[PDB]
Amino acid sequence: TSKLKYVLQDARFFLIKSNNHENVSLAKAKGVWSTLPVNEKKLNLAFRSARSVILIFSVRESGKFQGFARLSSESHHGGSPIHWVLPAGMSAKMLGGVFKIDWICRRELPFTKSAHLTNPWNEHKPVKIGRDGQEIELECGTQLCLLFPPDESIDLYQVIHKM
Ligand SMILES: CNc1ncnc2c(C)n[nH]c12
Numbered sequence: 001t002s003k004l005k006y007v008l009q010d011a012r013f014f015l016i017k018s019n020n021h022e023n024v025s026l027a028k029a030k031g032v033w034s035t036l037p038v039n040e041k042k043l044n045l046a047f048r049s050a051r052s053v054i055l056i057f058s059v060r061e062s063g064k065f066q067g068f069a070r071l072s073s074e075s076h077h078g079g080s081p082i083h084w085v086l087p088a089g090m091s092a093k094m095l096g097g098v099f100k101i102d103w104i105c106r107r108e109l110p111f112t113k114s115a116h117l118t119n120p121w122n123e124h125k126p127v128k129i130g131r132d133g134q135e136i137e138l139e140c141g142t143q144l145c146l147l148f149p150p151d152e153s154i155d156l157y158q159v160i161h162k163m
Contacts, residue, residue, distance in 0.1 A: 001146070003156040007070065007104065007163070011052035013141025014043065017132035018059050019087040024066050027057070028106055032082060033069075034095040039133030043099065044074045046135075051163050055101060056136070056144060058128070065109045065128075068145055069101040072162055102159050105151040109144075117144055 016033065018024050027033050033055060035043070046053045053071040058064065075097030084095055111128040118124040120137045127136060127144055136144065 001150070003160060004104065004146070007052055007156055007159055008054065008142050008145055009052075010050065011054050011070075011138070011141070012046045012050040013054045013056060013136040013138070013145070014039075014046070015127075015130045015132070015134045015136055016055045016057045017130075018057060019090075020085050021059050021062070021066075022085040024057055024059055026082065026084065027069075027101065028067070028103060030082070031069075031101055031103070033099050033101055034075075034082060034084065034097055035099075035133060036090070036094055037097070040075050040097045042133060042135075043071065047071050047074050054104070054141065054145065056141070063111050065111075065114075065144075065148070067103060067106045067108070067151075068148065069103045070159060071099055072102050073100040075099050102162075103151075104154060104156065104159065105145070105148045106153070107149045107151050109148045113147055114144055117147075 056068045057066045077096050117127045117140050119127045119140050122130050
């Protein structure tokens with residue numbers, strides 16, 4: 001876990017809520033994510049400001065987090081359309097900005113294991129609670145990531161080089 005801690009050193013953390021499992025599975029396979037423009041702008045700002053920006057994913061109604069990943073780029077808009085399963089009210093143009101991500105952990109964590117972690121940037125509510133795009137304060141974000149089971153399929157050596 002030493003390289004993982006190095007990656008998380010001085011990182012920023014954002015909670016990502018997905019309305020469906022399909023888009024998270026697509027993101028795990030293709031190494032990309034898209035979000036609404038309001039969160040798009042926040043992530044682009046954070047990417048320039050921090051050694052690592054970490055997205056922590058939770059599919060709505062799953063009672064779990066599905067893993068976490070590190071931004072490797074700002075968003076980009078002209079490309080082969082990612083076949084997101086679009087939520088009601090969410091257009092393809094809204095999700096047009098595509099971030100490239102490197103997965104750090106593709107394993108699940110149930111909300112029952114994070115009940116002791118609260119987020120100061122969301123009124124000290126349990127970290128599972130938050131809107132899509134909610135920033136998670138450093139210490140709580142770091143501890144949440146360290147709770148996930150190790151993903152032995154990942155080699156963080158390549159991630160460290162991009163820092
Ligand atoms: C690909 N991005 C997304 N897919 C499905 N749902 C959501 C939400 C609530 N934010 N971003 C989403």
